[PDB]
Amino acid sequence: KSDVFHLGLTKNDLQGAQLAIVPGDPERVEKIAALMDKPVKLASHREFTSWRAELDGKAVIVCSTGIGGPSTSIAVEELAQLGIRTFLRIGTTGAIQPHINVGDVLVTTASVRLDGASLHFAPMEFPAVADFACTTALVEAAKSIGATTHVGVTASSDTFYPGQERYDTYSGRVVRRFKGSMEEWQAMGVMNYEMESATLLTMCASQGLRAGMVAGVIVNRTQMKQTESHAVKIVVEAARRLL
Template identity: 50%
Template sequence: MNSVYHLDLDSEKIQGAKIALLPGDPFRSQVIAETISGIYGTYNRKLAWKREFCTYLAEIKGKRLLITSTGIGGPSASIAIDELAQLGIDTFIRVGTTGAIQEHINIGDVIITSGSVRLDGASTHYAPIEYPAVAHYEILNALVEGAKKATVRYHVGVTASSDTFYPGEERYDSFSKYVLRRFQGATKEWQRLHVLNYEMESSTILTLTASLGLRGGCITGVVNEGGTGKITKESLKAGEENVIKVAIAAVECLI
């Protein structure tokens, strides 16, 4: 029996699952699992919760899948992917929230990442920076079909994936109110380059899965207002609910 340390899982516990949904927030693992059970009338079970890694087992149309939280950022996401791969998972879909930087993108829309700008460090421990962080085409197609099935407005394109929430996303509402020169004006530049959004895990997830010969994808729900950094309880709820609906529909398409 194969076991892994950080996730507190083993090959027996996961019962042959091959697909993993990867929220950042550990409490979202339960929400996703219960949503799946509500839609399909199937069971769900918490397998483990250690540090930021909370894992549930669920079932869609007779196929078991895991919902494992990764915490915030690339380092912990890389641990989750590596250890899940060691247990036999071969398909990974990040299910998160995001801040849009294009004005035509609205609260509650979902962004399907085709590729990521690698503003992280963790991914460079698996592949050099020249290696592209790209989604697997089968996952990308399934996410698009899932959005159509769930009737949720979606956008497909490039994401800027940063190791830090404040300076890396050019936020000036931090403790210091200062952003290093390398990030000053970055948002305007990404906008001009048609980057859709900021988030913190996709570059790691897509680089690892592609370089390891696995299938990876990323879908995020928009939680900010009008291309600004402002997030409210209502906007967060809208983004979370829609991204979960689309992710579940996408898994059904894959199955």
């Protein structure tokens, strides 16, 4: 019956929904919809698990993207085909600034495009910027639930290891492009490393789709469980102010 190639979903399945909360982990999908009205599992294929929920009478989608830009770009595109116009990304991130602690919540304004997929939508010249209303909603909801929040630039990498300048690896080597890259992003005022924002933000911003980015700090490079739900409450509360 499916409308799209990967998600295994019809336009009818969205039930009029126009906004989607897009977490990375399939196992975090249900936990998010649970904070909303009438949650029901829609479909689960590959790393794309999807649920439908309700927020103030209007339908919303929660759908996982998986790790990295490519997988994300499949999800966002197919959700867009289905009718979704607003994308809210929740995820996890590693802070590169000393003042940001494990537990702090990060709202991304724009991202450093250290990926490949963004270039398949707009040339490097193009800014991987978030939607203004989405970011506003993400911050005003963050201030409203009493979260220690930092708003700024994120480094978005195609690799977990070398692109985020991790040295404790099989080779122990980091390619020239990324040698001392973290020290540079730090100096530029970049808050954090994650893997999906550059793709999400570029492909939405260059296709009239609205996207926001929020993430909870798991590790701090320079240096628990209640940490996560803050970003989960925020990404759900922000959704209400966007419907």
